[model samples]
Target chain A: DLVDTTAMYLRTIYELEEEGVTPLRARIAERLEQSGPTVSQTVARMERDGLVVVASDRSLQMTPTGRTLATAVMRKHRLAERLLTDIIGLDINKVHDEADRWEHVMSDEVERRLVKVLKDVSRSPFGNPIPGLDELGVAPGTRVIDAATSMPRKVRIVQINEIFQVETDQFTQLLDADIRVGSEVEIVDRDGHITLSHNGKDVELLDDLAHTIRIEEL
Target chain B: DLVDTTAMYLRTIYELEEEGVTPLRARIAERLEQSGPTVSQTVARMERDGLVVVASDRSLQMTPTGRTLATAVMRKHRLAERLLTDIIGLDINKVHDEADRWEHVMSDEVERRLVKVLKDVSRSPFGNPIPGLDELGVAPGTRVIDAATSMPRKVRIVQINEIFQVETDQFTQLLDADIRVGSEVEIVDRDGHITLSHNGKDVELLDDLAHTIRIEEL
Candidate 1:
């Protein structure tokens, strides 16, 4: 039970840390759709277990053990995403929720078999570089949020933020615009607004949406 | 939380019913490796939820809704076993525990894809006719326990009982003895003891172990 409850919190913290967002109990509660009270109790248990600590600013911080556990869950999640999409033929954008359930079920044997069967993928179908792939060999590419705001540079989408993935329509919008993980597009600043041009069609971007994407500039 | 806990109980009841054993709280508690108090609480919850009822003999009985949920969980469990063994190449005897975790995580979409990829199998690799294959159909098999004690009759091992599968050594014994589903053999009684002759070797059978096997007269 502790194992099960802690994984969601751990994975949530890991994803928040990866997204460069502050890992707070409120943020974890929001992401996991858990009540503040329930989240607090679990976090307290985690603190008691030495999996997490309350930082100076009241932010949640992972111990080395906590990070290791979080990375294990993330690795399982991403691998399941790839397996569902590539081997099982599940819808590409629909795998996040599916993999969320799957990550907890994954055993090391199943994970090993999946790697052998799926050829040890480095990226999930949703575009995130899988965590804990130290054995397999962040692969490559850079985050869109980190790129310079220079005009009209070609880039390829790499990772999508985990938070944005839960909103089904958000993924559909990207799909409708033909902006997939490997698809190349042009990023430009129209006066002040950041826009992406794909196949001569301009797509508006929010600062949050920009951070939600990982890309490599050409 | 109710959904997750109930699946195991419902599935267990369905299994015990299938095995012709009375579905008692003690049996369920033992099978699930849960404490008596924990099982009692969950059973009370299930009773409150209308998923099950305690019968005249204190045996558990499933309502129509409970049976449906149980069947759904069983279907997912068996399909996952097929997928793991046939496609992912997990060891034959190892998929039961793996599928135990997987049954809860399986989504209808993933179930649909598995049915398509696994080609709508009617039987799990372990030999049980998959439950809730209303669309696919249950194929054929008879329990070894029900077979007539007439000597030297030829039969084929069909399904291993789910109860016996969790014991690693039990499965290994079967594997080492070449007693697998679809393997043809002779069933005989040397005195009152039922024994199986496979490839010139006799497999001594316990009545308990006999109940754990499903077979068809060949």
Candidate 2:
């Protein structure tokens, strides 16, 4: 039987960390798209279960047990997403929802084995690192040259994550435009919006997207 | 958190089918390693769950859903066994227990993908199919010959098993023997003992041990 929760508690925790807000009751309610007493009741139950504890500042943190449980679920969620997308032939963007249902039942061994299976694969069908990797704390970085950056014409992509802001539209556009990790691009312009030349064409990364496109010092 | 019960159920079904007997309750009890009342309760629950149906003779047959679940679990078992043996570097005979723990909660996508990654591998650590494979259904009447069966004589093993049934002493002795999947063997009767001539030396297989050996027809 399902756990009888309308919201995924793990997602609530993830959102709370992202918002830098806690005590968890309010944050969990906001993240769950709920309100009032409902959130309080659920958080109370979680607290009673020893899954979370509130700090002096009232930012709720997962207890070690809670962290372990959340981490396990998180690993399974990502691993399941990768498997569904990469192997099950599910549409990349669609895998996350299906993976959510499955993660609850998957074992730690399953996540570990699945991770090893997709090792070194650069893209899940949607073109991202298969899950469980975020906790690893090292973002994916690639090196490529932007000829116009220097007198001799050379610069490389040192980093390229806009911090999980990769929406479906942007991802589709990037894929259609044939831009991915290890792709070569030349700096066409650095004034205002960042522009780079790739595959004999120029492309631009605007605002937040440009900041996410990190490059290394030559 | 473990699907040990599901695995035991599947193994029971497989063993039952192998013996051409599908008991409605008693054998299920025996295979489940549960008490008679527990077996009855399990069967009643299974019936309600649409996993079992009563045959005309009042014996039990697995419903399609049950078979699917059983085979799914079995397949997981086999694939995990294969991965642990082939990738993680575990002792061959020790894989059964490891795989038993790993199989239930593993994702189907992971198993399908890893098998592709490993590329057409068929045996586990101890040399058994990962799951879903009917070990006894191997080409009926096929004989897998040991080193003693023949030396330099051509024979093909139609039946290939990933499980190791040889005893420790015999297993060690087998390590010293140069017998593999595609080795030639010569059969000879030396002083009424069945001896095999291979690599210019004589190898003998006990009459009982010889039963497990499978070989292909010339």
Candidate 3:
């Protein structure tokens, strides 16, 4: 009942746009691990609902209506995730899936009161923002951590790219210190340099190239 | 529409029970101005819904559930009369027809809230105990102004029986003196025994006999 595929489709579009990707239909299908028709149908519904606009050049853009609707859904999903994390004691890896099931049924009044009650929550147990969700796309230099690359150095968590719902379990697994995004650590050495301190754990980043090791200054 | 026959049935049943008449189906039918089959069918439905019960001896008595539900409905009818009289500026005689139309649709919450809002209502606009309604039937005796005869000298108003809806204009004339059910009035004098001075005006009650007249004793 989570309708995981819909969340996956929306998050994929949002993720692609954030990474400066043109987010073509086929590319989105490839990235989502979905077939082309599935991706195309999803895009068509989102377009018909005015949640996205597909241009002649085959690039997609979110119209203002699309942006607003998407963000309202996104806000509900994230807030529900935070509630699952902070109140329900769900495992970090399990929060997203649980939130996906609950977001649609949460009433507006209950959501408003819950937000007021939990005013100071910074992140979901999975280390994602509890507030200000819609601005994530325009955030500069945001890189998604997907399964394709190995980030040998561990990092502290930052805001998660919202498009991680497609293979959410795999995506959240990447939050481990060895593979997680945004953990603070020092490169004690590399292959040529030999050792790496990943969020204070020494990891053998020597085998993986630093180019795929996504890191930035705090 | 205000179903006059239904109100008559309820009121007849209520008054009979108070006066040592077990709810006889034939009597209820006569009181309701209807045939026995019609009254029997309605009572059967009421019994099914726990409003009334047919006893082992085949006499009809209201069950506890029936009594509570009936009391609630009676309260609404009474309150509706008060509202039509006091607020809508309709004289007591004109209130019953309007109160009849409202009883079926008014909710329990609305009734409870209305009781709190209008605290001083004892009688309907036309001066009945909002009919068939009593505070646990606790308002003792209070005297029944006979429907068949005129008072000796009391400047009383006709609580035109259940037929008022059928003869609306007949009661409308009585409303002019504000002599509706619940109003206080003084008998100035009696003329010819059948006619009386109510509020210094000589008024005559025709011998045809109204079926619903009852005077509240001060």
Candidate 4:
């Protein structure tokens, strides 16, 4: 129980880093759907366990061992998502939850088997670069939610913000709108919410999710 | 954590019943490699949770709900074994442990996907009948380990004893000896140890595992 919980946090920390957001107890509880006090206690336990060190700004910085575990868990999660989404034809909403649980239990052998059978092992269904297998340096692009909206230039979705991959409702909404990676779209308007000329239809997103969607110039 | 542990015990309980052995705390501890006191505590918890009931003679009997979870876990386990053994080419020695860990994390969706991908779902790699996926009433035959050697009649191994499926060293030895299901062999001698003209070489098994192996008339 403790080890698996630690793994979840490690993966979360890694995700936060990849998304250019600071990892902290505040974000962890919100991301993981756990209470703040409980997250505090668990993070303290994680500190004791040497998985993370609290920095001067209070962001959780993973040690070498912690980063290793984080990559391992992330690798399993994305591979599992690939299997569920591409091979099994599982629903997008269900794939993340199933992959999260599978991450904890997958053996190295199972991971190897997945890499062997899977045709594309580089990106998650949402388009985040996979750990271990993917060569980095592809620009993740600018946040579509943070769009200037000054020029109505078209752009393609480079990736979904990794944090929103765990945000069930918003993630479901995006998938439901058929706004997947590589879909061509243009920023339409913005305020508390953002709208897009997405997939031949106008789709809107609240600020809560807008920050998590990324797009690149077409 | 509690739910997964209960699932393990429930699977053990079902296997014992299938193997025609009495389910008690004593056997559960040995089968699962836990202390007797801890097993008693966990079984007590299981009883309180309505997964099992203690009989007058101390046998643990499954309720309907309990059996459902047990069968569900077992189905995932054997299906995972089939994927590992037949598809992945994982080592026989490693497959059982990997499958056991996987049994805890498999979702119903993943299990269904496994059923879709796996070619054979009726039996585990060791030939024990898979719970939900297998039809009953293939006579499991007599224990070859308990051979009388009355006439030295040749027989084929119909199934390896399910209990021995967890008995690592002995199970590995059997696989190493190439004593698979449907293999032709004859009981050559028996005393404290039983000797078999298995394949082309003489194989010996101490009473410990011989009691678990089953065979049928060829």
Task: Assess candidate 2 and give its TM-score to the true structure.
Answer: 0.43
lDDT of each residue in B11-85, candidate 1, tens digit only = 998777655456799999999888889998999999999998887768787887887888889889998999998
Instruction: Tell me the tens digit of each residue's lDDT in model 4 across B81-123.
Output: 8877886677799998888887887767776766767776768
RMSD of 4: 14.7
How many collisions per candidate? 0, 29, 14, 1
Q: Write the per-residue lDDT of candidate 4 for residues A9-34, one digit (tens) a residue.
A: 98988776655455788998899888
Error of 2 at A179 (Å): 35
Structure candidate 1, residue pairs in collision: none
True C-alpha contacts between chains kept, each model in order: 0.93, 0.00, 0.00, 0.40
The positional error of residue B212 in candidate 2, measured at the CA in angstroms, is 28
Show pairs that collide, candidate 4: B145-B210
Cα shift from native, residue B160, model 2 (Å): 28
Residue-wise C-alpha lDDT for candidate 1, range A55-120, written one tens digit per residue? 777888688788778888989999889888888999876788888888888877777778778965
* Tens-place lDDT digits, model 2, residues B100-209: 65565565556555666564446544444344433212134444333332112334333324264543454444446565555544443333455443444445656544
Best by DockQ: 1
Report residue A66 deviation for candidate 1 (angstroms): 0.2
Ranking by DockQ: 1, 4, 2, 3
Q: What is the C-alpha lDDT of each candidate?
A: 0.75, 0.54, 0.51, 0.73
Tell me the lDDT of candidate 1. 0.75
lDDT of 3 by residue, B84-201 (tens): 4553344455456555545544444444445555646566554444332233232222223231221122324435454544545545455664456654343311222233233433
